[PDB]
Amino acid sequence: RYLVPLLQVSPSAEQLVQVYELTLHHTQHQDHNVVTGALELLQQLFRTPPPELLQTLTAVGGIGQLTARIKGDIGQSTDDDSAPLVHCVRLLSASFLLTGGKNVLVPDRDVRVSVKALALSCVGAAVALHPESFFSKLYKVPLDTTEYPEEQYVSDILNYIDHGDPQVRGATAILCGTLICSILSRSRFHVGDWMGTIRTLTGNTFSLADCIPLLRKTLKDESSVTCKLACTAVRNCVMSLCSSSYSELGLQLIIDVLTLRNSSYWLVRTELLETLAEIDFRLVSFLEAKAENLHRGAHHYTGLLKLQERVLNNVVIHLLGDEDPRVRHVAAASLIRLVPKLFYKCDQGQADPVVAVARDQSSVYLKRIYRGYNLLPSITDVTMENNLSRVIAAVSHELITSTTRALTFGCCEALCLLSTAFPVCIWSLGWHCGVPPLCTVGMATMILTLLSSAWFPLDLSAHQDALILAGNLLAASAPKSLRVWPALGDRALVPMVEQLFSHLLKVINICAHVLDDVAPLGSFYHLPSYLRLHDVLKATHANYKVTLDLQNSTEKFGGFLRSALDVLSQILELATLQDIGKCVEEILGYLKSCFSREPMMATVCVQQLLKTLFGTPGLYHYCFMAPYTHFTQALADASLRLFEPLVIKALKQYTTTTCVQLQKQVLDLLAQLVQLRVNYCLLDSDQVFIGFVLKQFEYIEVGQFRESEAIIPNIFFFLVLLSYEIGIPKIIQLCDGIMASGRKAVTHAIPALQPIVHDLFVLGKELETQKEVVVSMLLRLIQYHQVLEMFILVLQQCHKENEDKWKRLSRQIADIILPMLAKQQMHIDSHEALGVLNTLFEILAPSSLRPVDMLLRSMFVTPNTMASVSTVQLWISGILAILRVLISQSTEDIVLSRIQELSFSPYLISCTVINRLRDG
Amino acid sequence: WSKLNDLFGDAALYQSLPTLARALAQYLVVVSKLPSHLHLPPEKEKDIVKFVVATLEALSWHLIHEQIPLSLDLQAGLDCCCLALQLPGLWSVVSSTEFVTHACSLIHCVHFILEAVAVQPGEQLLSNPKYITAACEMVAEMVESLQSVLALGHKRNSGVPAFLTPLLRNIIISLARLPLVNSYTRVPPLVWKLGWSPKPGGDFGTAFPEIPVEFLQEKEVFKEFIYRINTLGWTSRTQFEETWATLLGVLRTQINVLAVQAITSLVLSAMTVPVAGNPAVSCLEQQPRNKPLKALDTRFGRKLSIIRGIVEQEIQAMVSKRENIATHHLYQAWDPVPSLTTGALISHEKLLLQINPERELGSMSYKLGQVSIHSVWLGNSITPGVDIHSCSQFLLELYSRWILTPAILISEVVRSLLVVSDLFTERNQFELMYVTLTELRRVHPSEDEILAQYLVPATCKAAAVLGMDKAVAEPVSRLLESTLRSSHLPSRVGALHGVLYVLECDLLDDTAKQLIPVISDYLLSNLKGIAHCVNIHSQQHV
Amino acid sequence: NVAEAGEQFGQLGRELRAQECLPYAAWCQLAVARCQQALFHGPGEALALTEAARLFLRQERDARQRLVCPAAYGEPLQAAASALGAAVRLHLELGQPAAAAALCLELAAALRDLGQPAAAAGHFQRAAQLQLPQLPLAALQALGEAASCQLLARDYTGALAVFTRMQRLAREHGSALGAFSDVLVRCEVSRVLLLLLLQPPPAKLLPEHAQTLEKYSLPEELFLLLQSLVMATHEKDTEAIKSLQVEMWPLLTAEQNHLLHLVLQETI
């Protein structure tokens, strides 16, 4: 049970089918400790199946090709004319939970209700794999019509909703969830045509009109353990109905979960909101307009059935005001999942609810300043800025008009998780409310009045989320305001920045007197408001130093010290030398004590100070007419020193640490002391630090290093930038070891050259010999689509430097890649991968593409075998990207004069040739 | 129901039922002010009971089929129903054995119009034959909503369109006063989860006995029984003494606090000037402490009374609060000042400027000035159906032995004794009130400022009915001077009502009226600060 | 001493809420605030005065909501708005007028619940002028709860003053965005149902009221049925007005459903 989660020479496809027949004999071997052992092993091999085993069971013959209480002929898992998953549902039922004569319960005396609970969860995970098993007859050869009047099918599994305890009526609550999830995805929402084929084959009368009222009932069940298991059944089942033909019954199950919002079991309320986060409320608003009886429903109501304003004001924002710290956190992550899915009425884009569903399915199928803020013109969706400004309207309203401690406290946690997925600087027209009335300062005036109260900072679980959100709302004014604090330039904005920079030097002043046991500009002595903040940072630090647990994300001081050095960073960008010149004394004393607890983001506090101490639309538009004209427009273009105590301490850490989040922020602190020309006196006598970077290349090639991936792009930026003062002869011998003698390329070898090529091709006779060396290495690596972004840099300099040299180099990679595209060695598996290769044939010189002798022998090819969708997928990407050349780079006249000479027969891939490859 | 769609369900017969529905709305209102030629006939009294039932069933028949009726025709049909439940003639006929079908069909059809408007699909309101107990369970659900759903201005009241929250609040009260229903509605909902279910028999469906004392010994169970008795009122006088005996056995200190407040509310429903026990029709009597004027009654003076009759009457249609009035009609001017040995009711046009300035226009509630001491002396001749005289002698014995108890129970016992003071009917009864309150102040500490602001209203209304004599003035005059210096702003307000009763009627002592310039000096200082800004300082201190 | 006097009054107030008295735990909270005027605690002095505001408004949901008493008469309703008088005056001297308007939106959500809808109109406009310099979308949601008061208070002429102030800010701040795009849908469907209810004379018809009535004589479903209703009351058409309330009842919300009921009566 621990290794099947990891199975997804290799473990063979005939090794895994020996595991599976071993258990069906052991679901019958009598015990109560041995029957329960092979039934937890079967529930998990269908949920996370190994992909070799997974195709041998859905297949029709199945095990027959690999070899070359029950009282009837079931038909074993060797027989043909039926899948083995048709076989495996007949077997686990007549032994455990069904008697082959009549729709009748089996007694709990015979089989335990701990043993009947794991047998209802194994019949459900196979229907998601092979849905034709549930409609089958129980016995293959019928059982004795003299004794029993009628034979029954496996639909008496769905009579265990009335059986007694939880986890049987709750595990037949989940057996109807994935029977509806996996008929719609099996036959593509054709519930009309697919049900006809079964009924003349196995004569049961079981529609999906007789299971949703069995699923509507267990949502209304009494026990709070019975209600946790019936609302995970609607996570699987209401995204498949609501876009299907049964979407009359699909809307009703959206309605009933809304009544389950006020039950008093804390696990019942958080699996509601995940089935209200996965709802597409632009597809849900479409069914309301079509309804006339469903608006009435029971008791003949008059008015509109407003699902959206009732599921967003009275659940998701309402469950922010819950008492539990478990229930408040899960409701924030849904407003990250609801905002792209709203459809409020009458935008200036999507008008109807018909036109709303059509734009989320066409983007799918038709195609250094600090982290806070932005300076671009910021191209943005006009209608996606409207759904994000109605979710920050009802959220700043249960924070100001609220009357409880619990509404103010868990709605500053739902505003910090918007701004890390929907940032303020990019979506500023959604966040804008008032301030500067036009690039915005949205809503940041209320939240400073929360922090300056002596009530709200006294608990570190949500005072650390009100500091990451007040630095996102004073940085979105940076593209506007910048031309005390002379760089702010907006005097209605200075008291918001005077306060946080006064608020963030008094919270690195209480974290300095806590990490060092010292008795109590930035000063918290004379304030009685911040002597309350000294007894709260000292309760969370007596539990760390006493209880050893290193790998915790949530620590509430180690989580709280991460929050107030992230936002002391983002303000110094707005500051200048003149404002900080009386405070370079101040902020450097605190960090020497604030270094040992969290040095990963205590140099991000030091990386920034040195910058600013040294200055630095109507369903014809959307489906066709807007994507048809991005096609033809890119074709006409295809026809074209107080740091000296603090700096020495950070170098002793890199030699002795092991966490590789800390090793990455120390290689950016030293690429800034060489640009800003600090003389190479960090190592006054010896070369102590530069000798240690060479040894780390020994541990990556062999593989004796744990997290080389997140350090190998930043190891190589430090080395090339020193050589302008280890020289570029020595730098390129280190990169050749990793590639041929070491791990794979898309983590180590391909991010290794992004620092070199950008710092060698972009920026006399010694420089000519080293450019021949770097171009030969990539020809061994053309196969990867990240290596094809590095080579669009190479072709644009030769058109600028020397146009005689520009045409020689586009001919050498013409006859390498076109032999690869016919033999499918080019990894074009992504849609990040087809975008890189089409901007290549524009920039490749047209003299190398002018004979059409080469582009056609690379076009009209047959792959090796088209059995596998790893191999079907790379043959149809070679035909789409050499056909963007025969339309722009050469007209119609040149192409067809050639095929008269080259005998390219039209029987190349014909219906006789395509049939022998999928099988072969 | 085959006959009901052809002889009744015609779209020509339906049009009459909102034109005949404005007809019976204005006729039943003026009954309280018509002569006896114009009252409804006794033989034609049956046919106006049967026609409230039949126009409210055409309202439920469109919501199923077509749309809303007109939603002005939601409003004209439920005004024929609110008035037949307020009259003493039409309400008695709905209660009898012959109309079990017609009183249980106004419960199915006012629960159908309130659920098909307020209850969005997939909710509820809040969070024997079958039809009688399907009518009996229907009324328990609707009264718990008046807390949440039908309270004028709640967060839950954004769904009802607020011209029915006057109309549908007055109509759920007067249907649970029916003897078909009333015995079940007083049982709080925490009881039916517990094991209480005796058999009913009263020649009807539900005739449950009253709740025994042993269930009331829990606070959450006791906070829901006191809700059912105030907004519901009571009935014929036999049911008034049933609730009296249940509260006295309750008389652990969390339940000693909340049942001294339940005895305050039972006396005031014997203090009401019409039907006296029905919060549907009526509200508490108040007395003007201002006398009737002298400037009228002359030949130029009788002309004065016609002109300002037109001006004041369309003010209350715009300015006032309609606490008294459910329906939407215009000339509903009704002030419950009685005559006085009580008598008839005085109309609104006759008391033109009697009402005291302490009160918002038409808002009828307790506001410390209900019975002025003008009206004590001429109903009870003393100048220096329930036996309401019986219930007030028993309450003087109980609240003196508790004073002469925890500090939570000290404050709420002085407040229950000041409210019943409307109903003291003897000069023997007012003398015992003043004696218990002065032995407290010398014993109880002076710095208890919750207790300080209920007793300055209490000690001052005694010495007014009593003689304001030289042995009484020197204790009463010294206590009013100190509390006006207090920093507690709701303690400032209770002490100023005690000035009035001393200043009101008694020819006051000559040395003590030189301490009116003690109270004259306080009034000048707090108007110059509350001349410009009134929004800042207060409302009911201003 | 005087610092140690304040810690003794805090242990007393918490053992009373489980004892559930609450005018006396409400009197325990006003003793914590009188000490911090002898010293100077500042923003912590206003924390003792607004936990005494939560405890006089819970004494009167047990007197006018849960236990609806006719003898309940506002001694803890006079007590509730007096501990909030000293609270708003102490944020302004320290200079935070955004925290002064959070405490005045709590006082006016009780008076709409306790049935005083005219003085509830009131305190909603006090908390907006403390926010119009600072948060112009926290300031426009305090004026949408001010139009739900005066229609309970039957101030239909004072209701035209508060609807033209919501629309004059969104043309200064919104032009609409978002949060400000839904404030302008509510204010051009409800200024049209008032000018037919009360039809103002051309002296007291402003140049802002003049612009919206020429356009008629916002969703495409509901924009078409509002041009049709300004025509009928100028034609006095009794058959035209009756079939529109049947066909505008699902479209509006029940705050806008109250203003359409009072037009069809005052024209019929």
Curated annotation (Swiss-Prot), chain B:
Residue window of motif Nuclear export signal: 171-180
Tissue: Expressed in the brain cortex (at protein level). Widely expressed with the highest level of expression in the brain (nerve fibers, varicosities, and nerve endings). In the brain, the regions where it can be mainly found are the cerebellar cortex, the neocortex, the striatum, and the hippocampal formation.
Source organism, top-level taxon: Eukaryota
Subunit record text: Interacts with PFN1. Interacts through its N-terminus with PRPF40A. Interacts with PQBP1. Interacts with SETD2. Interacts with SH3GLB1. Interacts with SYVN. Interacts with TPR; the interaction is inhibited by forms of Huntingtin with expanded polyglutamine stretch. Interacts with ZDHHC13 (via ANK repeats). Interacts with ZDHHC17 (via ANK repeats). Interacts with F8A1/F8A2/F8A3. Found in a complex with F8A1/F8A2/F8A3, HTT and RAB5A; mediates the recruitment of HTT by RAB5A.
Protein family (similarity comment): Belongs to the huntingtin family.
Domain statement: The N-terminal Gln-rich and Pro-rich domain has great conformational flexibility and is likely to exist in a fluctuating equilibrium of alpha-helical, random coil, and extended conformations.
Disease: Huntington disease: A neurodegenerative disorder characterized by involuntary movements (chorea), general motor impairment, psychiatric disorders and dementia. Onset of the disease occurs usually in the third or fourth decade of life. Onset and clinical course depend on the degree of poly-Gln repeat expansion, longer expansions resulting in earlier onset and more severe clinical manifestations. Neuropathology of Huntington disease displays a distinctive pattern with loss of neurons, especially in the caudate and putamen. Lopes-Maciel-Rodan syndrome: An autosomal recessive neurodevelopmental disorder characterized by developmental regression in infancy, delayed psychomotor development, severe intellectual disability, and cerebral and cerebellar atrophy. Additional features include swallowing problems, dystonia, bradykinesia, and continuous manual stereotypies without chorea. Some patients manifest seizures.
Protein name: Huntingtin
The species this protein was found in: Homo sapiens (Human)
Residues of the whole record sequence present: 2202 to 2829 of 3142
UniProtKB/Swiss-Prot annotation, chain C:
Subcellular localization: Cytoplasm; Nucleus; Early endosome; Nucleus, Nuclear body
Tissues where the protein occurs: Produced abundantly in a wide variety of cell types.
First and last residue of the signal peptide: none
Cellular component terms per the entry's GO annotation: early endosome; nuclear body; nucleus
Predominant location category: cytoplasm
Disulphide-bridged cysteine pairs: none
Keyword Aminoacyl-tRNA synthetase assigned: no
Keyword presence, Transmembrane helix: no
GO biological process, one term: vesicle cytoskeletal trafficking
Alphabetized UniProt keyword annotations: Acetylation, Cytoplasm, Endosome, Nucleus
Assembly: Interacts with HTT (via C-terminus). Interacts with RAB5A. Found in a complex with F8A1/F8A2/F8A3, HTT and RAB5A; mediates the recruitment of HTT by RAB5A onto early endosomes.
Function: RAB5A effector molecule that is involved in vesicular trafficking of early endosomes. Mediates the recruitment of HTT by RAB5A onto early endosomes. The HTT-F8A1/F8A2/F8A3-RAB5A complex stimulates early endosomal interaction with actin filaments and inhibits interaction with microtubules, leading to the reduction of endosome motility.
Disease (UniProt): Up-regulated in brain tissue from patients affected by Huntington's disease (at protein level). In a Huntington's disease mouse model overexpression of F8A1/F8A2/F8A3 impairs proteasome activity leading to the accumulation of mutant HTT and causes defective mitochondrial functions.
Name of this protein: 40-kDa huntingtin-associated protein
Gene coding for it: F8A1
